[PDB]
């Protein structure tokens, strides 16, 4: 027995949404709206529990709340549902037009969530607009930090190799998310060959064109952005600075 | 009793949420009224006294056409722009289930979907409405598991003077070409595939000349022969050789027995 496990048939799985890290996300109903990631054999089950233990403990207003799991009919992680869907969806699919204030607020909240994770020494490894979610009440919720133990966001040192992930590569990824916020575009949209992008970013010769950012993008945000995207990782700011900087420029 | 003004949903009672896609004459959003709704922003921001009256006439029609298997018209919006509001279908479209999330239906469910789609087309045609745009993209699945057809509205305006469902003579809209489109929907149901899936411009030419047609060898093993016969009838290249929907619905009513 286990408190945190949801019994078979207690969850109604609804519309398939897409595939995030390690699995497939569905809309679902567990005493309310929820999101369900179907994950992709004992021993493995115990390792899964050890992860559930860790997940149960990382709680912040700006990251998804872990609500429970299933084992049958399949491995599943259940979190709260975000009606606003993802940032990626709003920018590059439905092309929603956010006010600069909403964009800077989204950037602030994502930075708070990242600040929380990093202060807990957790490395995300996959920050991108696809798993930055918008909740009905207008707060940002980050996902895909779980199961700790897409190339467009990999810092140059991450691209060319080998568990290369670090705090500073997270900061880079966030830098790309600022690019998306401030340009409404994915970086490198004019290059079609993902293999040429990998190589060129990996060598440090390719990087986002910060001149494509909207006119009303404040000067400090552009400054911050360029810092986070700095090729030499130890030259990138930490998230307490990043959060501090965005808090202030919003004022 | 009610008149056109009555059918306006007062401004600010609908929160327009997420953009879903584009359907006929406009853009579909998810929305919240006293509940879930779908909102089609029409692509006309400044109506002239003739266009607005044309909109009134079409709304006049939408209010009279009701069947359990077609979308309920709930009202229209005025700001910032003209919009048609109908109910929300949590099951999204048939297309999304078959070709996106690649959901796997049992043969009994596949045929009830066909029956319900046929019940809906039968009503529309009995009301002399030609859909002109029938495809799995605008056959929607409601939470309660009933099928709801959409994009049948504004029929007359479409009259004023996506390729996979067009009858050869359409590559000219009639009941018989609607019946054709339904045939391709059968193909989608029974084969789990879109027609002509192995060809990547040639389709317009070859289907129109009758030298290309759907590969009927992809239909499931447990698919009944009556379903094959009907399907082949509906897809006939010569339009006058196709069945009518009363016939189509009857045949499906029985093999469902």
Curated annotation (Swiss-Prot), chain A:
Outcome after substituting residue 23 to V: In a colorectal adenocarcinoma sample; somatic mutation
Keyword field contains ATP-binding: yes
Result for mutant: residue 131 to S: In a colorectal adenocarcinoma sample; somatic mutation
Record's protein name: Serine/threonine-protein kinase B-raf
Entire-sequence positions represented here: 448 to 719 of 766
Annotated binding of ATP, by residue: 17-25, 37
Chain's gene name: BRAF
Disease: Defects in BRAF are found in a wide range of cancers.
Residues modified as Omega-N-methylarginine: 203
Molecular-function GO terms, alphabetical: ATP binding; calcium ion binding; identical protein binding; MAP kinase kinase activity; MAP kinase kinase kinase activity; protein kinase activity; protein serine kinase activity; protein serine/threonine kinase activity
Catalytic residue list: 126
Keyword line: Acetylation, Allosteric enzyme, ATP-binding, Cardiomyopathy, Cell membrane, Chromosomal rearrangement, Cytoplasm, Deafness, Disease variant, Ectodermal dysplasia, Intellectual disability, Isopeptide bond, Kinase, Membrane, Metal-binding, Methylation, Nucleotide-binding, Nucleus, Phosphoprotein, Proto-oncogene, Serine/threonine-protein kinase, Transferase, Ubl conjugation, Zinc, Zinc-finger
